[PDB]
DNA sequence: CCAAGTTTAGCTAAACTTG
DNA sequence: CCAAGTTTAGCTAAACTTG
């Protein structure tokens, strides 16, 4: 019920995004129009898991585009201490609330 | 190519991994016994994609465990400069 | 408790990649 | 070409989480 976009936010999310029209329609109805995921499961004959994933794809896409300014995602295999530091960097940024 | 394992690496690989006996059989058949994926596609009535995925789940598992002692894969969203630092570190291998 | 939503190994399609 | 293998959005099952 919580977790939502504007049309403008939504349009950003789906720009470039490689997904079909069903996914788009489901995500808009849920994220923009505040309708329950369950009415799309029912109406489309789909499990609730499928609908949660559809909504998730558009959600995730929006987040990947709204990372704090200047910030980058990074992944790497690191030795223990260097890995610990990344954990601490993040965790100290989470305990910045 | 062509990626392969002993039955002992294979076991190390899948330890702690949630994986069914079918994925196990396909992965063993291909990575240990050296058989081709197409074999299992027919014998089990699966698509090539499914077999290709089965082999992948185990291979990725092995990869994560043949990593050097203490080494860990990590992911984060950081300020560029800290990301720069992580890339610099990660290059050092 | 309840009902809605989440998660993840594992499947398909079908376009793509490799040798 | 073709044979075999890769990729990834989309789906399920059904345990688990959330409100």
B15 touches strand C (CB under 7 A): no
Using the CA of A54, give the nucleotide whose C1' is nearest: D10
- Cα–Cα distance measured from residue A92 to residue B81, given in angstroms and rounded to the nearest whole number: 16
Rg (CA), chain A: 17
Token digits of residue B17: 């991994």
Domain that holds residue A9: 1-97
Q: Say what the resolution is, in angstroms.
A: 2.3
Are A83 and B67 inside 8 Å of each other by CB?
no
Count of domains forming chain B? 1
A38 touches strand C (CB under 7 A): yes
- Nucleotides on chain D within 7 angstroms of protein Cβ: 3-15, 19
- Report strand pairing: A71-78 vs B72-79: antiparallel
Would residue B4 be called left, alpha or beta, if left means φ above 0 and alpha means ψ between -120 and 50 degrees? beta
- Cα–Cα distance measured from residue A1 to residue A55, given in angstroms and rounded to the nearest whole number: 12
Residue A63: closest CA among chain B residues belongs to which residue? B77
- Secondary structure of residue A57 in the 3-state scheme: helix
- A32-36: long-range contacts at Cβ-Cβ below 8 A with a sequence spacing of 24 or more? A32/A4, A32/A5, A32/A6, A32/A7, A34/A1, A34/A4, A36/A1
Method: X-ray
């Amino acid at each position: 019920m919580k977790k939502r976009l504007t049309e403008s936010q939504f349009q950003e999310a789906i720009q470039g995004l490689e997904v079909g029209q069903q996914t788009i329609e489901i995500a808009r109805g849920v994220l923009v129009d505040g309708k329950p995921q369950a009415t799309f499961a029912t109406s489309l004959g789909l499990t609730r898991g499928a609908v949660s994933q559809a909504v998730h794809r558009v959600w995730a896409a929006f987040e990947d585009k709204n990372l704090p300014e200047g910030y980058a995602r990074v992944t790497a295999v690191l030795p223990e201490h260097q890995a610990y530091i990344v954990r601490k960097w993040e965790a100290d940024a989470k305990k910045k609330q």
